[PDB]
């Protein structure tokens, strides 16, 4: 799409309809006449277009009204209401841009943000843009959080976020225009290589893949149509369902064989009865021919009865010779009908040991994408965010993803090496108690109007807690934390002096030996300028490979690469890094997934703010004090950078509305 309607798309909004959020802020317009709504929608879309066409400079209300036409530029308060709305909710003027109006002389309100990951950073920038006092508390010695980027010399490789999953409607598209991200497209061709180290023939490759895609749809069918979602009170996982589907496909293979050989026995048994009839006829023909012979040996002249005998027996013999020939006709038809059925049998097996191994690679790929064993994923919901996927080619950041959090961090109060230990929230305000990560006895205290918590779900899951909430988080929040899944996937960075792989191949798979180890080093990436190969560890393997040294891990990495490219074409790696995201105390995993028993609604719960009880009993209902952003809070875009980014924008908007008030709702 292009023009004004393309701007609404690029902003994840329907161009010709008012969203629920807009209905809240403009209940006068959406409940009013259709004509006004279209004026509103155009104003919105046009303003979005203006910002999108040039995202490196702030878009003021003045600059907006200037470039509007009649009758849209007639109602200036409507334009102002719209512009403010779009600024507040971070649809316009988000990220990194030159400010036309320098920041207000004095700040209003004080917000402490836990974590300087992308979700944190995004919100911070917004809140500063709104004129609030903002300080971020980071436990690490760097910004970015799960956006981690290895650097040494010319080697640049992401140990965290790596792929921009299409620019169509992606807020990262706007960011990439503001930040020097070297975005390179990924060629989706992925040649596989079995355990021995030799390519899977395009015959098998395409037929196993097709079976995979078909097995997936089958589970979807099991979910929606057959309603197979609860088994023994426990919710059914994607893994369970795939197993059930495969079993029924092996069952069908056997059912087909049974009824095919069942056809053969019924025909072979028809032949059995016909041959019995034929043997019992060739027996009577044998006897009857003898009788006719003996009647003919009686030379004439003979009386009429003796003449009749010869004739009678002659008739009777040709009559029985008529039947036998009509039965030899039938025998010829049934005998070729059995050569028909025995010629083309049904399928021998559903999948062979060679087939099932290649199918496991496809499962490993799915286990990588969701950073989790398919036995943990919700059957019904694991793919609930498919509907909102971006359009366009997937891209990699060639100069490392860290360039983004770093760019966002510029001009912000960020306390590094500061581990939050306790969050205290009361009707009158909040205090955050943090320590210095180096000397843990040195204690810090932060007083604020509001706390934005961007702690990863793995962190929030810790038991005993790494961060204590005072008062404790309500049951509805903690249950959401327990229910939701927080997955794990790891990366092995291999730096060489020379390219020994296909330079036009971005990714190539390796097929494991067993189901158990399907995730282990199952995929390799060639994305960066320098000779770097990146190896993924997914599924059940990821968790186990963390208890294994880098030397042993790189050992298996070289082994696999030797088997594929030649045992003397694979040199020793100059630099090697292995991530351990589950072990990392500031992550405790990689990213969230919809666990079995969870839903997309849990993501909503995670985003819901906390309002403390009143200090004095009988005192009015307090302001909400504790807010949550982060990858695990955004239902429609979880487990992503853009999703995190967006959730930060979301909260900054909600917090400003709370503490600076909404002037645009009149």
């Amino acid at each position: 799409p292009s023009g004004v309607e393309g701007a609404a798309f690029q902003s994840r909004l329907p161009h010709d309809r008012m969203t629920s959020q807009e209905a809240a802020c403009f209940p006068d317009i959406i409940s009013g006449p259709q004509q006004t709504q279209k004026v509103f929608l155009f104003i919105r879309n046009r303003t979005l277009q203006l910002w999108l066409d040039n995202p490196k400079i702030q878009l003021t209300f003045e600059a907006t009204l200037q470039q509007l036409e009649a009758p849209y530029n007639s109602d200036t308060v409507l334009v102002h209401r719209v512009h403010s709305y779009l600024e507040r909710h971070g649809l316009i003027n988000f990220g990194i841009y030159k400010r036309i109006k320098p920041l207000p002389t004095k700040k209003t309100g004080k917000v402490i943000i836990i974590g300087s990951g992308v979700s944190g950073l995004a919100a911070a920038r917004q809140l500063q843009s709104f004129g609030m006092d903002v300080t971020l508390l980071e436990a690490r010695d760097r910004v970015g959080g799960r956006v981690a980027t290895f650097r040494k010399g010319n080697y640049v490789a992401d140990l965290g976020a790596m792929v921009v999953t299409g620019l169509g409607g992606n807020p990262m598209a706007v960011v990439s225009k503001q930040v020097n991200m070297e975005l390179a497209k990924i060629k989706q061709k992925c040649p596989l290589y079995e355990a021995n180290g030799q390519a899977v023939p395009k015959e098998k490759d395409e037929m196993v893949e097709q079976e995979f895609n078909r097995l997936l749809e089958a589970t979807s069918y099991l979910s929606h149509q057959l309603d197979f979602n609860v088994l023994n009170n426990k919710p059914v996982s994607l893994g369970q369902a795939l197993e059930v589907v495969i079993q029924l496909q092996e069952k069908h293979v056997k059912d087909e064989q049974i009824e095919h050989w069942k056809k053969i026995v019924k025909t072979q048994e028809e032949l059995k009865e016909l041959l019995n009839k034929m043997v019992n006829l060739k027996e009577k023909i044998k006897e009857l021919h003898q009788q006719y012979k003996e009647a003919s040996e009686v030379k004439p002249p003979r009386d009429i009865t003796a003449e009749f005998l010869v004739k009678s027996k002659h008739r009777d013999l040709t009559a029985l010779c008529k039947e036998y020939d009509e039965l030899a006709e039938t025998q010829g038809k049934l005998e070729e009908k059995l050569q028909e059925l025995e010629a083309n049998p049904p399928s021998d097996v559903y999948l062979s040991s060679r087939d099932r191994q290649i199918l496991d690679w496809h499962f490993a790929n799915l286990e990588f994408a969701n950073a989790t064993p398919l036995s943990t994923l919700s059957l019904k919901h694991w793919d609930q965010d498919d509907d909102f996927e971006f359009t366009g080619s997937h891209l990699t950041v060639r100069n490392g993803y860290s360039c983004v959090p770093v760019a966002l961090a510029e001009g912000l109060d960020i306390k590094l090496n500061t581990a939050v230990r306790q969050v205290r929230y009361t009707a009158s305000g909040c205090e955050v108690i943090a320590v210095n990560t180096r000397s843990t006895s040195q204690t810090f205290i932060y007083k604020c109007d509001a706390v934005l918590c961007t702690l990863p779900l793995g962190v929030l899951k810790q038991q005993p807690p790494a961060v204590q909430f005072v008062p404790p988080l309500p049951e509805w929040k903690t249950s959401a934390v327990q229910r939701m899944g927080f997955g794990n996937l790891n990366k092995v960075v291999l730096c060489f002096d020379r390219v020994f792989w296909d330079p036009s191949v971005n990714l190539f798979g390796h097929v494991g030996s067993t189901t158990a180890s399907r995730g282990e080093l199952f995929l390799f990436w060639n994305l960066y300028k320098a000779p770097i190969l990146l190896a993924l560890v997914a599924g059940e393997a990821a968790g186990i490979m963390e208890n294994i040294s880098d030397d042993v891990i790189v050992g298996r990495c070289l082994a696999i690469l030797k088997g594929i490219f030649g045992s003397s074409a694979v040199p020793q790696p100059k630099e090697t890094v292995v991530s351990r995201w589950r072990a990392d105390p500031w992550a405790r995993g990689s990213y969230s997934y919809v666990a079995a028993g969870s839903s997309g609604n849990d993501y909503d719960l995670m985003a819901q703010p906390i309002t403390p009880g009143p200090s004095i009993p009988g005192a009015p209902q307090p302001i909400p004090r504790l807010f949550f952003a982060g990858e695990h809070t955004i239902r429609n875009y979880p487990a992503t950078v853009h999703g995190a980014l967006l959730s930060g924008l979301r909260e900054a908007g909600r917090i400003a509305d709370q503490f600076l008030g909404a002037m645009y709702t009149l």
Binding site: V163, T165, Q188, C190, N365, L366, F368, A369, N370, W382, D383, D385, D386, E389, F390, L507, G509, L523, P638, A639, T640
Partner: peptide, 6 residues
Amino acid sequence: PRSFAA
């Protein structure tokens, strides 16, 4: 998300 899949 399914989006990451190779």
